[PDB]
RNA sequence: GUGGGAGAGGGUGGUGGAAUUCCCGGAGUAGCGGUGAAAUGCGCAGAUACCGGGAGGAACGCCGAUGGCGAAGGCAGCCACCUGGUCCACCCGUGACGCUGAGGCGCGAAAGCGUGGGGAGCAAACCGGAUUAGAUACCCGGGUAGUCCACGCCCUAAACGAUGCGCGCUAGGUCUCUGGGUCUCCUGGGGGCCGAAGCUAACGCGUUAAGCGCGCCGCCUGGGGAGUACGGCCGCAAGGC
């Protein structure tokens, strides 16, 4: 699964300020954690499509968050990507 | 309509999740090996749901039977 | 690393030496699969509600352990090898849910 | 010529026939009867009277072995079940117990079209 | 975000008992089976019924329900690992980041197709027995594909609530599932029945709208011809759109 200590680790890594639990970056980064863990779950168990649903939904919400940030502050958007390593 | 007795009020403090406690799970099985319905047990939805699984757990172990023969018919 | 409960039902016909060997093998297999044993109940020979391996009795053991989850099904695998052992069932521990309280 | 004097009386009832198998306490059979052992041939074998005659002929066959006490075990739902019971119940044999061991699966096999739904 | 809840939601490995069939042994005799009645069939190479052992395939009785889960198809013995969705309390954080959605992509009961396994029971086709005026059937005895497994196809349906998705507004009573709380009761999510206003051609719907409103998609335009022909795209084919 995903332990609360890993969760705290990534939150605190991406928190804009101490106590930031809800920023765009914290969200995108959490979804990135879950997405990568689910993709690793789906290299095995490629016959489990009901989870694969949850995967498409996660990617979708992450793309909406990134499109939002892209609109509002392209600096933090590129910074986010450069940290997470997404878009390719 | 099971106006003879209800098994829960025929019992005191007990743990529904104890698969190893026979002398109580015994009380929830019928004269055959079958699991009693809520008419007799008087359990609730959640209660009968969990007791079911702990009885099945007990059946695998050989503590409760899967089926019995009917006597006296 | 989670908290489990190993149930073992083995042959009721074993004299003290062979059974002691089997318990030894249980301890050893645990040390090999990383089972920190928190407590143990030895219920011993006990009547079975149906014959298992044609024997109307079985010898019961129970271990509340803590071990890596990723190696649980491996461990059970090993425990099933001994002919003396006729039932293996591993279970995640749970908080007791009480009725008529 | 065994001199058993005590055994088990199996009853296999069905909607087509009723057949009695009388055994030693271990379960090995001594004698037996059914609707076809008596002169009944067609559908009459599935009668409570045919059952009665079958169980009586079984009990009388077993008297020749000097059997007194039996435990009865019924299997199958079908006419003549309870009539074979009552035939043995005062057949001369003493019925020590009646037990219904009719085999039921746990949803094992697919029945014929006849038995589906 | 935090902290708790519930579930046949999904994948993989492992595993438990009942039953059927078959094989072995024991005991035992003249039939069993089956039907409206029968016959075919099976049985003296010893069947049926009965006890003991063994093999294998499939399916999980009671629990179980007017119950739950899921987007749909659909999901039910148990254990473990991996994994999806959801609900509540707290008012903590982000600051309109929202809704819908042509095309696309993924999923998609059964049956059906390719390879390879498996094959107990059931069973299209087929072979018999009956019935009938006939009986290419309904009934009975057999039986191949198939039903099962891995992988790849196929893409349909009375795929049904015959009711697209989201959000706001509009009496209640009651049953139930699952939370929370000052736990007679209050409060949130889900499933039922009856009904206010209202709507409807009627049937009926009625806070789970088929009411009152807004947003976006899909679709209809008399019956037959016809889901046919042609063209195109897809498919191993059947065939699909
Ligand atoms: N999912 C399998 C089932 O899990 C049951 O237990 C399940 C639930 O009771 C339990 O609920 C958990 C829990 O942490 C708490 N109640 C809240 C939490 N959101 C839930 O976790 C949920 O969300 C996550 C993704 O975030 C999913 O991966 C997970 O499947 C889901 N249960 O999580 C478990 C896993 O889903 C039983 N073991 C059994 O019915 C069966 O194994
Ligand atoms: N075996 C448990 C289940 O197996 C599923 O798939 C399993 C089975 O479908 C498949 O066949 C197995 C195998 O041991 C071997 N080929 C033969 C064996 N009889 C089968 O096992 C099972 O078969 C069927 C279901 O198919 C069950 O009804 C039956 O209880 C069981 N014998 O083997 C797979 C595992 O190797 C899924 N993994 C999951 O649902 C679950 O773990
Ligand atoms: K056969
Ligand atoms: K079924
Ligand atoms: K339902
Ligand atoms: K409460
Ligand atoms: K109606
Ligand atoms: Mg969405
Ligand atoms: Mg073993
Ligand atoms: Mg007959
Ligand atoms: Mg499940
Ligand atoms: Mg033999
Ligand atoms: Mg012949
Ligand atoms: Mg001869
Ligand atoms: Mg011959
Ligand atoms: Mg047989
Ligand atoms: Mg046997
Ligand atoms: Mg075979
Ligand atoms: Mg039911
Ligand atoms: Mg739904
Ligand atoms: Mg629903
Ligand atoms: Mg349905
Ligand atoms: Mg606030
Ligand atoms: Mg602010
Ligand atoms: Mg959408
Ligand atoms: Mg589309
Ligand atoms: Mg399909
Ligand atoms: Mg199919
Ligand atoms: Mg095939
Ligand atoms: Mg094949
Ligand atoms: Mg073959
Ligand atoms: Mg064959
Ligand atoms: Mg057949
Ligand atoms: Mg047939
Ligand atoms: Mg014919
Ligand atoms: Mg006619
Ligand atoms: Mg073929
Ligand atoms: Mg449907
Ligand atoms: Mg419908
Ligand atoms: Mg409805
Ligand atoms: Mg519905
Ligand atoms: Mg609607
Ligand atoms: Mg629809
Ligand atoms: Mg939405
Ligand atoms: Mg409601
Ligand atoms: Mg429902
Ligand atoms: Mg109404
Ligand atoms: Mg009105
Ligand atoms: Mg009316
Ligand atoms: Mg509405
Ligand atoms: Mg159209
Ligand atoms: Mg249309
Ligand atoms: Mg026209
Ligand atoms: Mg048309
Ligand atoms: Mg068509
Ligand atoms: Mg064409
Ligand atoms: Mg082609
Ligand atoms: Mg055709
Ligand atoms: Mg063509």
| Cα gap D52→D20, rounded to integer Å | 10
Query: How many CB atoms sit inside 10 A of residue D44's CB?
Result: 14
Hits for CB < 7 Å against strand E across A residues 9-28? 11, 16, 19-24, 26-27
Beta carbons within 10 angstroms of residue A61's beta carbon:
13
Residues D78 and D46 sit within 8 Å (Cβ to Cβ)? yes
- Interface chains of chain B (3 or more CB pairs under 8 Å): C, D
Strand partners, D18: D13
Is the minimum distance from the CB of D14 to strand E below 7 Å? yes
Half-sphere exposure of C15 (CA within 13 A, CB side): 1
Task: Report if CB B37 to strand E is under 7 Å.
Answer: yes
Cα→Cα distances D57→A37, D29, D30, D62, D68, Å: 75, 15, 13, 9, 15
Q: Identify how the structure was determined.
A: X-ray
Total domain count for chain C?
A: 1
Counting beta carbons within 10 angstroms of the beta carbon of residue C66, is it exposed (0 to 12), middle (13 to 18) or buried (19 or more)?
A: middle
Residues 29-48 of C with CB under 7 A from strand E: none
User: With an 8 Å Cβ cutoff, are B62 and C62 in contact?
Assistant: no
| Closest CB from B66, B67, B72 relative to D98 | B72
**CATH architecture label of D1-117:** 2-Layer Sandwich (3.30)
CB C58 within 8 A of CB C86: yes
Query: Which residues, in sequence order, are CB contacts of D115 under 8 Å at separation 6+?
Result: none
Which value in Å is the resolution of this experimental model?
A: 3.5
């Amino acid at each position: 699964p995903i332990t609360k200590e890993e969760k705290q680790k990534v939150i605190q890594e991406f928190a804009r300020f101490p106590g930031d639990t809800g920023s765009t970056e914290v969200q995108v980064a959490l979804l990135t954690l879950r997405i990568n863990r689910l993709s690793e779950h789906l290299k095995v168990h490629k016959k489990d499509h009901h989870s694969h649903r949850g995967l498409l939904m996660m990617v979708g919400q992450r793309r909406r968050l990134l499109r939002y940030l892209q609109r509002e502050d392209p600096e933090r958007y590129r910074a986010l990507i450069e940290k997470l390593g997404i878009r390719g | 309509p099971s106006r003879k007795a209800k098994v829960k009020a025929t019992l005191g403090e007990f743990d529904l999740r104890d698969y190893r406690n026979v002398e109580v799970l015994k009380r929830f099985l019928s004269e055959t090996g079958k699991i009693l319905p809520r008419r007799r047990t008087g359990l609730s939805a959640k209660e009968q749901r969990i007791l079911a699984k702990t009885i099945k757990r007990a059946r695998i172990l050989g503590l409760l039977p899967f089926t019995e023969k009917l006597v006296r018919k | 690393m989670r908290r489990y409960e190993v149930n073992i039902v083995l042959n009721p016909n074993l004299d003290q030496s062979q059974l002691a060997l089997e318990k030894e093998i249980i301890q050893r297999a645990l040390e090999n699969y990383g089972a920190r044993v928190e407590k143990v109940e030895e219920l011993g020979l006990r009547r079975l509600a149906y014959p298992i391996a044609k024997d109307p009795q079985g010898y019961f053991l129970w271990y509340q352990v803590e071990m890596p989850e990723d190696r649980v099904n491996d461990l059970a695998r090993e425990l099933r090898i001994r002919d003396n052992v006729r039932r293996v069932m591993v279970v995640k521990s749970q908080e007791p849910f009480l009725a008529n309280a | 010529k065994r001199q058993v004097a005590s055994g088990r009386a199996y009853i296999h009832a069905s909607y087509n026939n009723t057949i009695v198998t009388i055994t030693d306490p271990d379960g090995n059979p001594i004698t037996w009867s059914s609707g076809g052992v008596i002169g009944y041939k067609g559908s009459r074998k599935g009668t409570p009277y045919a059952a009665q005659l079958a169980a009586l002929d079984a009990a009388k066959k077993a008297m020749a072995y000097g059997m007194q006490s039996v435990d009865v075990i019924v299997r199958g739902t079908g006419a003549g079940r309870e009539q074979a019971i009552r035939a043995l119940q005062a057949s001369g044999l003493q019925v020590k117990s009646i037990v219904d061991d009719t085999p039921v699966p746990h949803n094992g096999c697919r029945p014929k079209k006849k038995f589906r739904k």
